[PDB]
Design an enzyme around this catalytic site. Sequence first.
Site: not given
Lengths: 156, 156, 156, 156, 156, 156, 156, 156, 156, 156
Positions: A96, A99, A122
Amino acid sequence: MIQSQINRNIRLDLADAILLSKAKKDLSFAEIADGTGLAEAFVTAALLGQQALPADAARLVGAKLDLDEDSILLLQMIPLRGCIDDRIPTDPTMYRFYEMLQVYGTTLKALVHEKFGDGIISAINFKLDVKKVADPEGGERAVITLDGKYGPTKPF
Amino acid sequence: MIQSQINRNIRLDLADAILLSKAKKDLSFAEIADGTGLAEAFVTAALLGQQALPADAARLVGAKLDLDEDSILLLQMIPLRGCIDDRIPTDPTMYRFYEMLQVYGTTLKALVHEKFGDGIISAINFKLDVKKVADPEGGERAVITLDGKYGPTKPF
Amino acid sequence: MIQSQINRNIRLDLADAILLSKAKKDLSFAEIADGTGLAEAFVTAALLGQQALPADAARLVGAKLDLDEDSILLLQMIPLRGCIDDRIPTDPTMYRFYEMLQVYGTTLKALVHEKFGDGIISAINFKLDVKKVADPEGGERAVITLDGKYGPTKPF
Amino acid sequence: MIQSQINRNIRLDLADAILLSKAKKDLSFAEIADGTGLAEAFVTAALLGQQALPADAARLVGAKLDLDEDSILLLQMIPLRGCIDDRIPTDPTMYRFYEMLQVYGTTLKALVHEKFGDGIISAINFKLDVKKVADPEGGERAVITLDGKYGPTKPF
Amino acid sequence: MIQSQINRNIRLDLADAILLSKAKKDLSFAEIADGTGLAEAFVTAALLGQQALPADAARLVGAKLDLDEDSILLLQMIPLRGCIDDRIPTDPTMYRFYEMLQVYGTTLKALVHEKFGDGIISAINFKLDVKKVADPEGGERAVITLDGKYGPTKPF
Amino acid sequence: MIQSQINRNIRLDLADAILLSKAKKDLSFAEIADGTGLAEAFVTAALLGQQALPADAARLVGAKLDLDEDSILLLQMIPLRGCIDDRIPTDPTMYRFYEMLQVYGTTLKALVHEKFGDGIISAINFKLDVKKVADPEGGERAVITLDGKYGPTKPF
Amino acid sequence: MIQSQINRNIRLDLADAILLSKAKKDLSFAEIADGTGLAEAFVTAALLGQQALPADAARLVGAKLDLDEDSILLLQMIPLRGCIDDRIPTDPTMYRFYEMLQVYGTTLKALVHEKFGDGIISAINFKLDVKKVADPEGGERAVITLDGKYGPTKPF
Amino acid sequence: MIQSQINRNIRLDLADAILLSKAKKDLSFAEIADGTGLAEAFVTAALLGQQALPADAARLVGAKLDLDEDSILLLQMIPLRGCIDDRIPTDPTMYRFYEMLQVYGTTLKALVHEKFGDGIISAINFKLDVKKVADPEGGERAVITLDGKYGPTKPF
Amino acid sequence: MIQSQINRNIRLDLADAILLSKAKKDLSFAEIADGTGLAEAFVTAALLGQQALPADAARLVGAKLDLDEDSILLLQMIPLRGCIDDRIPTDPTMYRFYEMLQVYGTTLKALVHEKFGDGIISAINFKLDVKKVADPEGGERAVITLDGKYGPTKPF
Amino acid sequence: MIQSQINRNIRLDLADAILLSKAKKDLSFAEIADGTGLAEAFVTAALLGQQALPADAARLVGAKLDLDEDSILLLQMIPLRGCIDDRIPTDPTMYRFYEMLQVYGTTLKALVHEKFGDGIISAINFKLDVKKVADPEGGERAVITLDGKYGPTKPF
Ligand SMILES: [Cl-]
Ligand SMILES: [Cl-]
Ligand SMILES: [Cl-]
Ligand SMILES: [Cl-]
Ligand SMILES: [Cl-]
Ligand SMILES: [Cl-]
Ligand SMILES: [Cl-]
Ligand SMILES: [Cl-]
Ligand SMILES: [Cl-]
Ligand SMILES: [Cl-]
């Protein structure tokens, strides 16, 4: 003297042993991190081979998990980082987050450049936390905060 | 009637055209999303081919960017999502987010399971926002909030 | 207002057009960058799609290469960086630098941790230069200086 | 008689064993290389499977690290070089050097051609060093020098 | 002034145009290289985007093939080398050379180290040639000679 | 009765064992192949897992290397050929041969078709040898001769 | 004079053009190959960019398909062979032949070695054919015959 | 009760054990398959992990090879099929069959559709055999017969 | 006469044009399939380049979508099937079905063998349907039926 | 306290051991799931490393298969899900389900959007079942029902 690793498998193998011991003792990550002075996400990352623990922290968690001396020393080594087996996660829980990058990656780029400038957010001067929040429509939400320093790209 | 795409290149090509017009008008993403009633991150994602706009929002951004009719219609189509060219980003700005996953992916899994249970944090019942804050030590930080619904995995 | 790209091909296509013009004009990178107040390596990287030029530099190189106004605007846009076609270079000249990494990558890691600590050497707060030097044995050597800020990894 | 390897794993396994011993003895790479007559970057590379040590150097580091005879002999073999697990590093410290190639790879090609000519800079007739230098804006920088022989391609 | 390419497709597209012209005129590679003062293998490689031609030779072959001025200029550019579409050849003719490497790659390494020492056989200070020789058992054989400079590994 | 392998790791593991023995005995490939009546390149390839030795040859090299009976039997098995770990070599020595293909692959195809016709140069009805020759300009050259049968492709 | 290709896309684009013409004229592969004196499988392979047609054959099929002169000339070029888009077929029809390799690949190797010896079955000295046979249980079967010359691997 | 595998390595490890036994006993595949009532290609595929043997055949080959009880049981399990290590074979003998697909794959598709219709030739309702024949030109040929059911596409 | 494709891009480009037309006319897949005699999933798959339409169906949908005659003929071609751009879908909607395979693929294998036997479930003798069902807990569920012929793997 | 895994190989190795014990005991998956109170598909997935069993079910199956206590605890761990070895299945039975996605993936996306709207069909709030029926034409069909919650994508 600082010590570092070059092959992730030594610490990932340690991670597996850690997780078995943890399971056998029925410990949580919250309790393992208690007393170290370091954030749960940091200590957990260390156990899982993605961070190094200071000697005192390594000894503390090592005691809790009944780790041998080599394991306690291995926890203090600077890791060869990279937790994903083969670039793209297979696990739904991990996937997820990937995604989120496939959907919003270019938006993050665009909005970083607009808000900050050319450069990066960063992943080293960086912290993460995971908070549980009631969803008003029912159930629970995770509010995950990625907090990184802006590093500008300037001409030279 | 809802309309969907199956080849990301149609909407990615439109994104390039949108960005050219945007640059020629010296517009910001903030100004473009202003008045749509939708979050900057959502409208920006739509422009970049990763979300669909409601018709009124599509017409409005299309006015601001001088987009033709087909382009305004394309913005309303449900996209074939996936912004990363070839799985792993090459761009440093985008790559840092992928590195957050290489360093903390397994930690996120572990802490999601401990805090919520077996299941996932949703990338669909989901929102994100990027906030610029001061770094106490000097400079600026991005605080990126990922806010997703917990979806449990329960036996059947 | 800052403007950014999400498809590298727009700027890589421009780079090809810039190289054809440069060849037609029989120009060097040293002479293109002359008068910009910017280092040859930075201006070159910009032409090649990997850095953004400030407006005055863009107009200046634009004049030298007879670029149209869409091109001069494009050179000011923040790129979608990544010059290597498909992860590993095929070109021998580029490949040798990748070979340096295959040979010394872990040694760089090891020595960075020893000399600096846990963390990274930045590719962002970064400069590089290329110097040509006589080889005592005959022939010539390249001395390429990578100069990056040490980013420490600090525990939270 | 010269001896050579064909499978990197034999030397990479030895490297891990060397690193465990090094950590147990709390030794530095600087200390290990001292007395060999060979540069810290070269000896370190050898320990990490990327260079061969001459017999006297192999015996010296062997004694320092309490290595067995087979291990001391393995260190003298010409290695099957390649330190990167799977083409692109996952480790942030190693990754920054790869990113330097994604950003500046084509610039390094262009400037090599302009400054030297058609051909390559060697990774084999080559030296590397890592220096720490104070940053005038605060903190530290790494100045990493890649020094390689220019090898021209001329027609035939 | 030396000029170089960064995207192989410009010269590889030129190559396809050259091949069509060559076919329309029913010319051989031998005929094309005649009068250039350069070996048939070197000239053929240049036409196919893998070498640069000196100006006189570029003009010569350009005249033979009815090429335009931009094309003749492009042949003079130092190419972004790499003829193989996607790492492993699909064409049976080209594949057999790859298979030679899959069968004898480690033997070549071992024998090079034994006969020469630690280092490499150059692909830059290098020539190759293809000769047809009668097979005593019937038919014909190709004797392909790879002739490269031994580049020793230089300790430091 | 002929015996064949289907998993390369068995013979490649044997190869590693042979190389340790070889190094312990300080033997050369030349001397191992002496008395076999077979070419150094062929015997070496066999040891390294890429060819099968006839029983007498296997026993001879087995005696030299103090191999067990399972090992001498394995040397006689037809191997599952392919010496490169993951398609593209990482080792510089091996890589140069691959680069020859990246630079000259399409030239080899073109000249093979011109000099011989449609079809292939065989990797099976094939021999290779490596010769050291003084370079008139100083140092040493490798002359590697690939000697393959032309296999024509004709319509059916 | 023989002519050869180095980029498959030229002939594969031609193939697509050929297929459109074929469909518009409602032609079969059987009929296109009639009068050519060459097997259906060979001529079809040529149309589809995997073989070269003799001049007379090219002119014949070219008249049938109303191809232009450049297309007829292209059909006579020795192709850059490789019909599979990206190594593993996606198309179910093509995929089944790949699956036959995944299931019986090692069996084919084993039985080839047992029945013939070390070496190969040729894909060049080779023909194939496809026959329709009634299944006694109902429906139809394809009997596809691969017929290749044994090429032995012998010591040298 | 039917039993099935999910990890190919269990049966592939078994295959290696079988081949070692087979070599020690100097047995042929023909001899092993004799008396099983199954085709040698089917039995061989089973030994190599690509098919399941009925109990009686499993016990019979187990007696011939001196296999233990767990091994005889494993042979009866439905396998996790797929013999190729990493999608494309490296072994020349196996590779030739892959090359047949690279040259003829689209031809096979085209001729299957013309002779049979839309659909596939089955790799499941499928048999294959390898026959050695005399080459009228001298030497030997393999006639490999692929015999599969035509499976028509079923509109709905 | 049956006609077939070898390059998916021809029909996928047609799919994009179809989808634009469909959008402009504000049509549904349900209504486009109405009157063809074919299931919505079948006709949709055809439009998207994964099935062939019979001539009457091709003319009907063609009229509805205002397609030209070449487009109508292309829809009748047997496609080069494969809808996923690069093996693993990027689109979340498509990805979930891949994830079902990542989680349940081995379970499907296991339960197919226990319930049917050794063999496969067909994707060619196959039908698909998607039904919307109220979720008793609130919201909606998709009930997706995969209905495929069982093809047994029997010994020969 | 919930416990989770980060390396799939621990549970996949357990699955292999489970399957051996299951074969030795001649058990079915139906039998094993009997008396757990959980669906056969869910319990099977668990054994195969893709789900977690509640403690009571873990002990019940553990007893049936003679598993040790570490194994019974392992079955209760939340897995690192992902059953496919390397993205694309090699096994024909598993592959057909992947082929359903190659043929119908874009159709599934299209119909999901048409019937439900923008969003996904869940692989988490999800169930599946496999049913064997007679085929009217002879033989049998599998009716596999995928049943997932619609998760809408809405603006924010
Ligand atoms: Cl946290
Ligand atoms: Cl935002
Ligand atoms: Cl410079
Ligand atoms: Cl140093
Ligand atoms: Cl030549
Ligand atoms: Cl030799
Ligand atoms: Cl045929
Ligand atoms: Cl057979
Ligand atoms: Cl439906
Ligand atoms: Cl079920």
